[PDB]
Amino acid sequence: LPKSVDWRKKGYVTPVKNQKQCGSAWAFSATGALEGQMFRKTGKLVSLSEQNLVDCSRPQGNQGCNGGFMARAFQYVKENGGLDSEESYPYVAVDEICKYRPENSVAQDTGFTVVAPGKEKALMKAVATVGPISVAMDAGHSSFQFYKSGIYFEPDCSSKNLDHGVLVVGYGFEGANSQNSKYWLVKNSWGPEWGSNGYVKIAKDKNNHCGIATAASYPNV
Ligand SMILES: [Cl-]
Ligand SMILES: [Cl-]
Ligand SMILES: [Cl-]
Ligand SMILES: [Cl-]
Ligand code: NA
């Protein structure tokens, strides 16, 4: 596999978004993975609608602003036949009436692929060969809230009890040796002001730190 990957440098990733006071990170993680796969298929980068997922995917087991899961969002897009653009179905950060319009759909998927749980090497292969990957993580720490630079490593992090969905856009390493001081490049949904332009470097191959490889998946387009 490549020594490093960064799908932002290839046009696969939209500018950083902000979920605000709504527990919809699972929806931003799912739209980020679908934006990359639609870009790989068509060559067009189009921002997708988190609000469409928040308002319409309760039957699949999501709970809008009270939480949800990326696989359930990809299941909804498959059963639904489509997903509207961010432009046509804007984000308001509260649970609202489902206003899905097929004529405004700009994306589709046939289901999703799961990365084997807990396998950082399996996540590395998916990121190198597919594009950005949806992942769950333990983000419940002040050290994450105030992250700004460096490789994030928190002793209090759990690899099994997770509470936040994010998007792995690549991986890399510090220095000249590609085999040490490794990190995952992660896009968050707390706005560009959070973290480093809305991103964080999370320690890689340090025993599945913060659970990044515990529940990873991507849509099949
Ligand atoms: Cl459940
Ligand atoms: Cl999931
Ligand atoms: Cl840094
Ligand atoms: Cl940057
Ligand atoms: Na920084």
Numbering used by the authors: 1 to 221
What does the original paper state about this entry?
The nitrogen of the amide protection group at the peptide C-terminus was bound approximately 3 Å away from the ND of catalytic H164. The amide likely shared a hydrogen bond with the deprotonated His residue. At P4 and beyond, the features of the electron density maps became weaker and less precise; however, it was possible to model the peptides KPKKKTK, RLSAKP, GNYKEAKK, and EVCKKKK up to P8 in the averaged kick Fo-Fc omit maps. MPD molecules were bound to the primed sites of all structures.
Addressing the elusive specificity of cysteine cathepsins, which in contrast to caspases and trypsin-like proteases lack strict specificity determining P1 pocket, calls for innovative approaches. As a working model, cathepsin V was chosen because of the resolution of diffracting crystals (up to 1.3 Å) and crystal packing with accessible active site cleft.
